[PDB]
Design a protein around this ligand. Structure first.
Ligand code: CLA
Ligand code: CLA
Ligand code: CLA
Ligand code: CLA
Ligand SMILES: CC(=O)O[C@H]1CC(C)(C)C(=C=C/C(C)=C/C=C/C(C)=C/C=C/C=C(C)/C=C/C=C(\C)C(=O)C[C@@]23O[C@]2(C)C[C@@H](O)CC3(C)C)[C@](C)(O)C1
Ligand SMILES: CC(=O)O[C@H]1CC(C)(C)C(=C=C/C(C)=C/C=C/C(C)=C/C=C/C=C(C)/C=C/C=C(\C)C(=O)C[C@@]23O[C@]2(C)C[C@@H](O)CC3(C)C)[C@](C)(O)C1
Ligand SMILES: CC(=O)O[C@H]1CC(C)(C)C(=C=C/C(C)=C/C=C/C(C)=C/C=C/C=C(C)/C=C/C=C(\C)C(=O)C[C@@]23O[C@]2(C)C[C@@H](O)CC3(C)C)[C@](C)(O)C1
Ligand SMILES: CC(=O)O[C@H]1CC(C)(C)C(=C=C/C(C)=C/C=C/C(C)=C/C=C/C=C(C)/C=C/C=C(\C)C(=O)C[C@@]23O[C@]2(C)C[C@@H](O)CC3(C)C)[C@](C)(O)C1
Ligand SMILES: CC(=O)O[C@H]1CC(C)(C)C(=C=C/C(C)=C/C=C/C(C)=C/C=C/C=C(C)/C=C/C=C(\C)C(=O)C[C@@]23O[C@]2(C)C[C@@H](O)CC3(C)C)[C@](C)(O)C1
Ligand code: KC2
Ligand code: KC2
Ligand code: KC2
Lengths: 213, 222, 211
């Protein structure tokens, strides 16, 4: 699937897996499971990177004028804003994304909607609607307003291709932002905004230090 | 009632708006009970809230303009000129607790299977009439009047007039739930209702706080 | 209206220009409706923008000339020599809300398919006449003077005259948006529109689209 998909994404280059990562048999789950996991990982990273790019650009200039967000400046690094955020807010955000992730991982639910797990014939990135949830669920994650629920089939794959490419571009973009943030001059022509000095992969560095470190 | 009955009711309340449930409470099965009973509970809730809100609108106008009873000591004890939300907070808590328990006795009377089936109706969730209130015929002790029409008026009303009146009840309730909350929101949040700026006296307390002293932590006794 | 009819209508609007659609918005499915629906929505949007822009051109002139009624207190009390935007911004907040809420009710009435179907029309996306504002027959209380043509000067007009009038509506509104936005631009960034520079478009120092 990866060869044909790569040619669809960029037919000139065709296929470039220089490290043969598809060939490597991840967790001994089979090459098909490697392909499924890798495609789902690329899509997950692309979605989160696209959102993180837009969110970084927004947070560098605007904050919500109600508390606790009104107290944060916008003239600092967005990573610094996250660092200042209260410990409870950090844990709650991470727990909410954990809910979305474990709901995506729940086999019974996406099986209800007619999908399998991403590494066994599951089309990568089919998030489920919150119908199996217990109490009222007014909206969903994908197509929350049900605007384009009746989309076109060929459009439903052209959009996947565009999503993959835009996700790749956003991966490199958000990481360029983080690079210039924690290392000034890391991305030339980007050294204009924010130079916080701390690890962005430390969700609770401001709160606590894990023992042993 | 069925969802078809709700659609008909909505199209009779407002032909243009029609059935306008965008959150699907009419479809969510409440407590696992059938749609015909969730519709009953939701419709009874709409009627009841509209009732209480219409009464609350008139009462808020009465309290803000200090039209008080002339021959009671509690009203005299409450200071004059207060905001209508504060005219509730300045009362002895024992009177609040008796207003609330009066509503409790009345809403225990209403939902009673025996009284309803003696008078002929059933519960609003059991296919009965939503927004009905049984009279005090099976009461332990005699009492002079019922709640709905303590006097005789509408004892000889046509079913057409009753249907028109129930439609007007639902519509006026929908409007009064918004008018009374406009009063409360302008009182506790100035410049929230744009048209009442400088009309509704301001207020600082919580209108969703019935008793001054917290009953769950430290009540007061008399 | 189908896209062939859209090309035809563009030709009637201007034989020379034709179907100038550089963004191809007509060939689309907004919110997943049909192409005919997208055409209906775009047509209603164009007609409504032209209508509001035509009224806004007249209103901007009328305000810039400080022409105010001889019976009102609010306008007569409001300061004179102001720009139209300053005049709107110093209008009372309640007055602004009544204006916007009546416009809201008119939009609701226009969109309401029950009323259009009672009058033998449909919603514009679902196949119908774009820009038709229904009468007020269905109102709870029987008002006089329906919105379009309250006194009834076009009741006996012919279909051909009406089609010509709709084409004129679209084109005149097309330049009306340009004119009103020229006034707003000249009150904002000076020298945006050269020609008005002599008349002295009353400068305004706020973002109009932020009530
Ligand atoms: C990609 C994930 C991501 C992450 C990890 C964060 C993290 C943060 N954002 Mg958010 N943010 C995001 C995306 C994200 N944002 C996006 C896409 C936008 C643009 C719409 C914003 C816009 C934004 C603003 C304006 C602010 C934050 C703030 C914050 C902080 C508190 C959490 C919050 O308010 O949630 C954000 C709210 C959400 C509903 C979740 C955002 C992501 C979804 C995908 C958006 C859905 C789009 C929909 C049309 C609306 C924290 C540092 C605040 C801050 O820095 O305070 C200290 C703050 O002022 N964010
Ligand atoms: C407690 C919360 C929680 C949980 C249970 C998971 C669970 C998962 N995440 Mg993670 N994830 C989290 C928080 C969480 N995430 C947050 C807060 C974010 C947003 C910043 C992400 C963003 C994210 C991405 C972008 C990806 C994952 C992936 C994964 C998978 C493996 C991760 C792993 O084993 O790493 C520990 C070892 C799994 C479905 C990966 C996946 O599913 O790949 C197929 C993947 O691509 N997660
Ligand atoms: C919607 C509910 C509601 C609530 C919570 C209150 C709350 C209060 N009212 Mg009442 N009041 C209401 C509606 C309500 N009112 C209405 C609709 C009216 C118009 C008749 C009044 C007229 C009124 C007066 C004249 C006075 C109060 C006063 C009071 C206080 C003590 C209770 C009392 O005197 O009973 C109120 C008497 C009733 C008969 C009950 C009212 C509710 C039912 C639905 C009335 C139906 C009409 C009936 C035929 C008479 C308290 C702030 C007193 C006060 O300010 O003390 C400090 C006071 O003097 N209220
Ligand atoms: C003790 C008195 C009492 C009793 C027995 C009832 C009984 C009822 N009310 Mg309530 N109600 C009361 C007072 C009371 N009410 C008062 C004073 C008002 C204001 C006038 C209302 C206004 C009201 C409305 C607007 C509605 C009800 C509804 C209901 C029904 C379900 C409520 C429920 O249990 O959900 C909630 C359960 C709870 C335990 C709530 C939490 C309460 C706190 C935390 C504890 C308080 C303890 C108490 C005061 C002692 C039921 C017929 C609903 C109905 O009929 O739907 C069809 C409805 O829509 N009531
Ligand atoms: C310095 C130098 O020399 O080089 C570089 C260095 C470096 C760091 C790489 C740089 C960078 C950063 C870059 C270029 C970053 C790019 C980021 C990128 C590419 C960000 C995409 C976001 C997309 C989103 C949020 C999509 C939402 C999409 C949504 C919400 C949808 O509605 C989905 C949708 O499918 C539906 C459901 C319906 C369909 O009808 C179609 C649509 C789409 C509507 C520099 C500085 O610029 C230059
Ligand atoms: C800002 C300021 O200063 O002032 C502002 C703020 C302030 C004071 C707050 C204001 C106010 C008043 C407001 C906003 C009041 C809000 C009141 C509100 C929102 C009251 C909910 C009651 C819910 C109940 C009883 C739930 C029962 C729940 C029960 C019994 C259930 O079983 C639930 C159920 O789900 C289960 C468990 C299973 C399902 O199968 C079935 C259902 C769904 C039934 C003002 C006027 O805006 C002014
Ligand atoms: C402003 C001012 O100062 O004005 C002045 C004006 C003026 C005229 C000078 C004055 C006066 C005189 C007035 C106003 C006199 C009023 C007299 C009045 C109103 C006298 C009622 C009697 C009722 C009785 C005995 C009840 C029996 C009750 C019995 C037998 C019952 O068991 C009743 C009951 O059986 C029912 C009905 C039905 C059952 O279900 C329930 C029960 C079993 C409980 C005042 C006071 O000075 C004030
Ligand atoms: C801000 C902006 O821009 O806008 C707005 C915002 C806001 C806040 C909404 C505004 C407001 C005010 C509003 C809309 C207020 C609405 C209030 C409302 C809707 C109040 C109904 C009471 C009904 C009662 C008490 C009925 C009793 C009826 C009873 C007890 C009956 O006897 C019924 C009856 O059937 C019987 C049993 C027998 C029959 O013979 C017939 C009759 C009728 C006798 C403003 C200020 O205007 C501006
Ligand atoms: C060739 C070229 O260059 O482009 C190509 C490509 C491109 C761009 C894709 C194309 C296009 C489309 C175009 C050009 C579209 C333009 C649309 C445009 C320009 C639309 C304006 C609407 C204005 C409204 C609704 C105003 C309301 C105004 C109102 C309600 C008011 O402000 C009222 C008021 O002011 C008064 C009257 C008096 C004051 O006291 C108070 C205020 C201020 C409140 C074309 C056609 O293919 C051509
Ligand atoms: C941060 C969130 C996020 C972003 C920024 C983002 C952007 C883009 C872009 C880029 C501009 C395009 C063009 C695009 C297109 C499509 N997205 Mg997508 N998307 C996000 C999230 C999700 C989720 C959760 C799902 C999803 C889906 C689809 C499908 C459906 C295909 C089908 O069902 O056939 C199509 C066509 C569903 C799916 O399964 O995709 C594999 C699904 O559940 N997306 N998506
Ligand atoms: C403070 C509360 C309150 C208010 C503000 C209020 C307002 C209005 C308005 C508004 C303009 C109209 C037009 C209206 C009309 C009718 N009301 Mg109503 N009403 C209140 C309370 C009660 C109670 C307790 C009952 C009741 C009823 C009826 C019936 C009988 C129908 C039937 O017998 O078929 C009709 C026609 C009885 C019932 O059974 O309603 C289903 C009943 O028990 N109402 N009611
Ligand atoms: C402020 C707003 C406004 C302006 C500035 C404006 C200007 C012009 C001009 C410019 C010189 C012309 C030439 C013109 C012509 C026609 N207008 Mg028009 N119009 C405005 C508003 C409305 C509304 C609300 C309606 C309407 C209509 C018609 C019909 C009827 C056709 C028919 O009955 O078949 C014709 C011929 C009605 C309709 O059906 O429009 C689809 C209708 O409801 N107009 N209109």
């Amino acid at each position: 699937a990866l060869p044909e998909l790569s040619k669809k994404l960029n037919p000139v280059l065709g296929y470039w897996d220089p490290l043969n990562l598809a060939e490597l048999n991840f967790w001994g789950a089979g090459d098909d499971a490697t392909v499924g996991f890798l495609r789902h990982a690329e899509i997950k990273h692309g979605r989160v990177a696209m959102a993180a790019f837009v969110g970084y650009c927004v947070q560098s200039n605007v904050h919500f004028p109600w508390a606790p967000f009104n107290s944060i400046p916008t003239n600092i690094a967005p990573a610094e804003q996250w660092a200042q955020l209260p410990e409870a807010a950090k844990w709650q955000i991470i727990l909410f994304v954990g809910f979305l992730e474990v709901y995506s991982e729940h086999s019974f639910i996406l099986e209800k909607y007619g999908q399998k797990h991403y590494m066994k014939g599951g089309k990568p990135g089919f998030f489920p609607d919150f119908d199996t949830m217990v109490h009222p669920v007014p909206l969903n994650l994908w197509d929350p307003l049900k605007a384009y629920k009746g989309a076109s089939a060929e459009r439903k794959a052209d959009g996947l291709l565009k999503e993959v490419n835009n996700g790749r571009l956003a991966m490199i973009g958000i990481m360029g932002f983080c690079a210039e943030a924690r290392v000034p001059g890391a991305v030339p022509a980007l050294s204009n905004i924010a130079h916080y000095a701390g690890d962005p992969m430390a969700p609770f560095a401001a709160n606590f230090h894990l023992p042993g470190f | 009632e069925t969802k078809a009955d709700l659609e008909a009711l909505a199209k009779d309340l407002n032909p243009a708006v029609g059935f306008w449930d965008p959150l699907a409470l009419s479809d969510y099965s409440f407590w696992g009970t059938s749609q015909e009973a969730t519709i009953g509970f939701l419709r009874e809730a709409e009627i009841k809230h509209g009732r209480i809100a219409m009464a609350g609108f008139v009462g808020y106008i009465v309290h803000s303009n200090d039209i008080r009873w002339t021959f009671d000591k509690v009203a005299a004890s409450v200071p004059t000129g207060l905001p209508a939300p504060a005219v509730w907070d300045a009362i002895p808590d024992i009177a609040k607790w008796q207003i609330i328990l009066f509503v409790g006795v009345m809403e225990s009377w209403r939902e009673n299977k025996v009284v309803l089936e003696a008078e002929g109706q059933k519960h609003y969730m059991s296919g009965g009439k939503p927004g009905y209130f049984p009279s005090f015929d099976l009461l332990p002790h005699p009492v002079p009047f019922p709640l709905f029409d303590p006097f005789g008026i509408s004892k000889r009303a046509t079913e057409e007039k009753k249907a028109k009146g129930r439609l007007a009840e639902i519509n006026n309730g929908r409007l009064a739930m918004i008018g009374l909350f406009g009063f409360l929101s302008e009182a506790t949040v100035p410049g929230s209702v744009p048209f009442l700026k400088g009309v509704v006296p301001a207020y600082t307390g919580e209108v969703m706080a019935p008793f001054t002293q917290n009953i769950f932590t430290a009540p007061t006794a008399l | 209206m189908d896209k062939s009819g859209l090309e035809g209508f563009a030709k009637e609007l201007n034989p020379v220009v034709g179907y100038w659609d550089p963004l191809n918005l007509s060939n689309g499915e907004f919110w997943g409706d049909s192409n005919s629906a997208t055409i209906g929505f775009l047509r209603e949007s164009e007609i409504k923008h032209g209508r509001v822009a035509m009224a806004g051109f007249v209103g901007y002139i009328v305000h810039a000339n400080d022409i105010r009624f001889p019976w009102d207190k609010v306008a007569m009390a409001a300061p004179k020599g102001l720009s139209p935007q300053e005049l709107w911004d110093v209008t009372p907040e309640a007055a602004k809300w009544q204006i916007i809420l009546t416009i809201a009710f008119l939009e609701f009435w226009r969109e309401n398919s029950y009323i259009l179907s009672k009058e033998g029309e449909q919603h514009y996306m679902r196949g119908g006449k774009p820009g038709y504002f229904p009468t007020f027959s269905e109102l709870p209380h029987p008002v006089p003077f329906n919105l379009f043509d309250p006194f009834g000067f076009s009741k006996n007009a012919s279909p051909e005259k009406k089609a010509k009038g709709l084409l004129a509506e679209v084109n005149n509104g097309r330049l009306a948006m340009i004119g009103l936005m020229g006034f707003l631009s000249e009150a904002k960034v000076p020298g945006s529109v050269p020609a008005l520079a002599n008349v002295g478009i009353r400068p305004y120092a706020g973002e109009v689209m932020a009530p």
